[PDB]
């Protein structure tokens, strides 16, 4: 049996599927540890930046998880991303730790750039500013991508990077209630937020997993930006990112929020 989890439809997902909105033909970079093939899980290419390893394959769960939450396949097993027939490209950016590099997300995003996707991805953080990494998010949004990424878990009232830089948007998470989640980051350059708390998803080894971050807040919007895209072919990352915001739901202070939480449904009217 197939399982909706919640925060799939609480950013009404299922809505725009219902209008024959998946994400088909929107190419989505998943900057993360990789992504495992997985029996609920279309992966159609990607790369490795990561030293000595080729292979995009995921080493750690998180990149796996974080693109089942944009494009779990809409079947008759496992979970349902909010765009489900969303191209997936695997880039890995991070180790199996979990850890990576300027040069290493940098280099996913000129990928990016070079490999004409939409929408990039990036659940993922640095705590410290680098001029090549916003330069490699201008660079990716100036050949046409939408830089998404995560605002970070710190709980602190300042957004990590890339997602405090102009250029990315800035994901917080929110939880059941719909508050900010108390780890999530927020301040000046948070864009908009959407579930962070008990998410499940796709993970390695055909196994499915629940867990919590701003990271599983950012497919959200990764995915809603694929139905946007879908329903608006011709629309660019600004105005993608635009729409998005001014159809979310507010749910208070810019500052702690954003424009509020992703609302795919209203996205997609
Ligand atoms: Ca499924
Ligand atoms: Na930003």
Same mark, same amino acid.
């Not at 993360?32 to 995009?56: K, M, Y």
């Not at 940098?106 to 330069?135: D, K, R």
């Given at each position: 049996?197939?399982?909706?989890?919640?925060?799939?439809?609480?950013?009404?997902?299922?809505?725009?599927?219902?209008?024959?909105?998946?994400?088909?033909?929107?190419?989505?970079?998943?900057?993360?540890?990789?992504?495992?093939?997985?029996?609920?899980?279309?992966?159609?290419?990607?790369?490795?930046?990561?030293?000595? *390893?080729?292979?995009?394959?995921?080493?750690?769960?998180?990149?796996?998880?974080?693109?089942? &939450?944009?494009?779990?396949?809409?079947?008759?097993?496992?979970?349902?991303?909010?765009?489900?027939?969303? *191209?997936?490209?695997?880039?890995?950016?991070?180790?199996?730790?979990?850890?990576?590099?300027?040069?290493?997300?940098?280099?996913?995003? *000129?990928? =990016?750039?070079?490999?004409?996707?939409?929408?990039?991805?990036?659940?993922?953080?640095?705590?410290?500013?680098?001029?090549?990494?916003?330069?490699?998010?201008?660079?990716?949004?100036?050949?046409?991508?939408?830089?998404?990424?995560?605002?970070?878990?710190?709980?602190?009232?300042?957004?990590?990077?890339?997602?405090?830089?102009?250029?990315?948007?800035?994901?917080?998470?929110?939880?059941?209630?719909?508050?900010?989640?108390?780890?999530?980051?927020?301040?000046?350059?948070?864009?908009?937020?959407?579930?962070?708390?008990?998410?499940?998803? &796709?993970?390695?080894?055909?196994?499915?997993?629940?867990?919590?971050?701003?990271?599983?807040?950012?497919?959200?919007?990764?995915?809603?930006? =694929?139905?946007?895209?879908?329903?608006?072919?011709?629309?660019?990352?600004?105005?993608?990112?635009?729409?998005?915001?001014?159809?979310?739901?507010?749910?208070?202070?810019?500052?702690?929020?954003?424009?509020?939480?992703?609302?795919? *449904?209203?996205? &997609?009217?």
């Amino acid at each position: 049996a197939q399982s909706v989890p919640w925060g799939i439809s609480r950013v009404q997902a299922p809505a725009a599927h219902n209008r024959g909105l998946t994400g088909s033909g929107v190419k989505v970079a998943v900057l993360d540890t990789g992504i495992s093939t997985h029996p609920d899980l279309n992966i159609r290419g990607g790369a490795s930046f990561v030293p000595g *390893e080729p292979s995009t394959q995921d080493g750690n769960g998180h990149g796996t998880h974080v693109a089942g &939450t944009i494009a779990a396949l809409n079947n008759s097993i496992g979970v349902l991303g909010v765009a489900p027939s969303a *191209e997936l490209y695997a880039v890995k950016v991070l180790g199996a730790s979990g850890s990576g590099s300027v040069s290493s997300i940098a280099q996913g995003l *000129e990928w =990016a750039g070079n490999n004409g996707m939409h929408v990039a991805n990036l659940s993922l953080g640095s705590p410290s500013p680098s001029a090549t990494l916003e330069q490699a998010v201008n660079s990716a949004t100036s050949r046409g991508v939408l830089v998404v990424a995560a605002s970070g878990n710190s709980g602190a009232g300042s957004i990590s990077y890339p997602a405090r830089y102009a250029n990315a948007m800035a994901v917080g998470a929110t939880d059941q209630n719909n508050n900010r989640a108390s780890f999530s980051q927020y301040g000046a350059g948070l864009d908009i937020v959407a579930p962070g708390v008990n998410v499940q998803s &796709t993970y390695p080894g055909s196994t499915y997993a629940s867990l919590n971050g701003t990271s599983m807040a950012t497919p959200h919007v990764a995915g809603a930006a =694929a139905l946007v895209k879908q329903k608006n072919p011709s629309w660019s990352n600004v105005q993608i990112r635009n729409h998005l915001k001014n159809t979310a739901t507010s749910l208070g202070s810019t500052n702690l929020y954003g424009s509020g939480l992703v609302n795919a *449904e209203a996205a &997609t009217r």
